[PDB]
Amino acid sequence: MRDMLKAGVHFGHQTRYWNPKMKPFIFGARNKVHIINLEKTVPMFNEALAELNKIASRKGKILFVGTKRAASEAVKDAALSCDQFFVNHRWLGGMLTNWKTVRQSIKRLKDLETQSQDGTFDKLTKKEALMRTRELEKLENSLGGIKDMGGLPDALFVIDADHEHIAIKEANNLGIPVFAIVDTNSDPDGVDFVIPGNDDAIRAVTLYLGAVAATVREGRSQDLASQAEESFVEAE
RNA sequence: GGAACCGUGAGACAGGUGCUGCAUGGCUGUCGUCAGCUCGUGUUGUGAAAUGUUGGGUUAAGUCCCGCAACGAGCGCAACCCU
């Protein structure tokens, strides 16, 4: 299970771009950063982790959102260790509301790939072929992780409430729990299960995203494994 | 006896570039070949509406690229015919 006393990674972040709604989580600004209370972060870890093991052992799906280039690679690897979905590139208009029509773009993607592998690849004009390549590119970029969705999630995990604020809104009107590791620059009231921690920093986001993923595989039907996201921490 | 056309007598009836196109169909002229004009759904607003068609680069052009709650689509453009 998780370990306490993480005063060598997370803690405070962001200079003076804070939101007054985050005072109950700030220790005390010193020369620059506001600094977060590691004493309050722990109790949050427990409450947030408790609700986690609930949906984990309940066979509930989670959607890890991460558009920020600070945890772009971490959000995927963490979502790979477990059988969960994720959004790494960019968050479309009516993916859940207008599911049917949106999937028609997925079917065309699979239909074009089957036509690009070898079957009738260079039969028609090249201009029309180059047209199928662009469509594939555009489709593969936006339909990268939503291609595995065949039915409408139980919860969403964000890395920053403000950056993925759009994901927070749609998750609120739908009545879906929201887990996320945000800091001073945000509104905690929007997160029913918030984790006061550094939003940025690769070594910061990987810790929890790796511990949370580890707590998911355990208490489900799998054994704990070493985090491969640590190799990406060498970005420093 | 009787089909046909035809002529006279008799009956029932036609016809009108006669008016109104501000009662109209159809067709045509014109601003225009001028270049853009809109829709479905989502989001924002009490609402009329807005967003998307704004912004940066670029082009003969919403031509294209980049960014962006927008995602797609239709008429137009382009392409498909002839000299």
Residue with tokens 């029913």: A192
Give burial (CB, 10 Å; 0-12/13-18/19+) of A63.
buried
Q: What are phi and psi of A85, to 5 degrees?
A: -90, 180
Strand B CB-contacts below 7 Å: A 90, 92-94, 97-98, 102, 105, 138, 142, 166, 169-170, 173
Chain centre distance of CA A157: 5
Residue with tokens 């996201």: A229
Measure A123 CA to B82 C1' (Å): 28
CA atoms within 13 A on the CB side of A39: 5
For residues A202 and A229, give the distance between their C-alpha atoms in angstroms, rounded to a whole number.
Answer: 10
Q: What are phi and psi of A46, to 5 degrees?
A: -60, -60
CA atoms within 13 A on the CB side of A215: 19
Q: How far is CA A222 from CA A74, A80, A178, A214, A215, in A?
A: 21, 14, 24, 10, 10
- Strands A178-180 and A155-158 turn out to be parallel
Nucleotide closest in space to A170 (CA vs C1'): B43
Measure A196 CA to B29 C1' (Å): 74
Measure A102 CA to B38 C1' (Å): 22
Tokens of A103: 């999937």
Resolution for this experimental structure (Å):
15.0
Helical (H) or strand (E) element with A63:
strand A62-65
Where helices occur in A57-121 by DSSP H, the ranges are: 72-81, 99-116
Measure A128 CA to B80 C1' (Å): 14
> How many other CB atoms sit within 10 Å of the CB of residue A186?
25
Measure A160 CA to B55 C1' (Å): 26
Contact indicator for A87, A65 with CB cutoff of 8 Å: yes
Reduced to 3 states (helix: H, G, I; strand: E, B; else coil), residue A60 is coil
Alpha-carbon torsion angle A146, A147, A148, A153, nearest 10: 20
For residues A159 and A124, give the distance between their C-alpha atoms in angstroms, rounded to a whole number.
Answer: 46
Nearest to A189 by CA among A173, A213, A172: A172
Q: After which residues, if any, is chain A broken (C to N > 2.5 Å)?
A: 91, 152
Contact indicator for A52, A215 with CB cutoff of 8 Å: yes
- The residue that minimises its CA distance to C1' of B69 is A93
Tokens of A101: 């029509």
Contact indicator for A148, A172 with CB cutoff of 8 Å: no
Nucleotide closest in space to A166 (CA vs C1'): B69
Is the alpha carbon torsion for A214, A216, A218, A222 positive or negative? Answer: negative
Which nucleotides on strand B sit less than 7 A from a protein beta carbon? 40-44, 68-72
Measure A233 CA to B29 C1' (Å): 75
User: What residues contact A107, with CB distance under 8 A and at least 6 apart?
Assistant: none
For residues A45 and A181, give the distance between their C-alpha atoms in angstroms, rounded to a whole number.
Answer: 10
User: What residues contact A46, with CB distance under 8 A and at least 6 apart?
Assistant: none
Q: How far is CA A214 from CA A5, A61, A81, A91, A223, in A?
A: 19, 15, 8, 25, 9
User: What residues contact A42, with CB distance under 8 A and at least 6 apart?
Assistant: A4
Measure A46 CA to B44 C1' (Å): 38
Residue with tokens 């600004």: A29
Nucleotide closest in space to A95 (CA vs C1'): B71
CA atoms within 13 A on the CB side of A152: 11
Q: What are phi and psi of A93, to 5 degrees?
A: -90, 95
Reduced to 3 states (helix: H, G, I; strand: E, B; else coil), residue A16 is coil
Reduced to 3 states (helix: H, G, I; strand: E, B; else coil), residue A179 is strand
Chain centre distance of CA A43: 22
